[PDB]
Every structure is written in structure tokens, then in C-alpha cells.
Input
Amino acid sequence: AISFDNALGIHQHTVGVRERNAEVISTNIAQANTPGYKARGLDFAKELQAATDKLYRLPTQPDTGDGNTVDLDLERNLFMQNQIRHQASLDFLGSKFKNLTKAIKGE
Amino acid sequence: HPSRVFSMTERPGHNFAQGSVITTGRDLDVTIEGSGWISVLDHTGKEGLT
Output
């Protein structure tokens, strides 16, 4: 054993997925006013399987002739949650090397 | 959820009740007693009721 795949766990992939998720939410907020755009959601378990997709969000309310299915209340909350979890993933993956370096150097 | 309902203003019809009659004593003044129309043709030529 003793390999980076096992030392880092899955925290090496989660940081990437949280970046992709943040990009999609940023797209949804920007495309909220453009008619005909369908809100895109990212399935977390899919990138989990890709580590070891880009779906559509069904609206809770009807459109108003635009056909745009973006709820700005939902997007802000989902962007806040993703950003908080992204920082935790950096903390988890960052400490993997800090412990790894301390084991090797002994100091 | 069925929460958004638009409303549009439209003309459902017209009021066809008899108008106010003005007695003028002029020979060439005519008013329709009760319901009825006068058929006339406009500038283009298409006939219509007045």
C-alpha cells in the first residue's frame, strides 16, 4: 500500500466536484433572465462514480412565458452550501499532506 | 404548483341599448326606433352597419 490514492482518500476528487457544482450554479443565476434556458443541476453521486450528470431541474412553479426554470431563491442557497462545503474539502485535503509531511520528516 | 394565473383585458361586446334621441325638427335626421341598423359603405367600399 502506501500510495497517494489511499493517503488522500476521496478528498482529492471532492474539491473538483464542488468547483464544477459552483460553475453550474453560477450559470443558472446568470441565465435566469434569458428565456428558454432550462436550469441545469449536477448529480453529486455521478461524479462520485466518475471518481471511483448535468441533469435538469424540474420547476416547483410554472413559467411565465419565458420557459426559464431557474429559481433564484434556490440557486443562492445552493451556492452558499456548496461554497461552505468546498472550504471544508480544502481543509480535509490540505491536512492530508500536513499529516503526511509530519510523518516523513518526523518534525 | 398552480399558483400563477395571468389576466388580460378584452372587449366581450358592446352596449346595443337605444341611444338618447335628440328631437331637432330637421327633415333629414333619422333615428332607428328600437333595434336595427342602417347599411352604408365606407370610403374603401366595404359595406357595414351604422
Remarks:
- Chain A touches chain B at residues 60-62, 64 (CB under 8 Å).
- Helices of chain A lie at 4-8, 11-30, 44-51, 72-105.
- DSSP finds four helices and two strands in chain A.
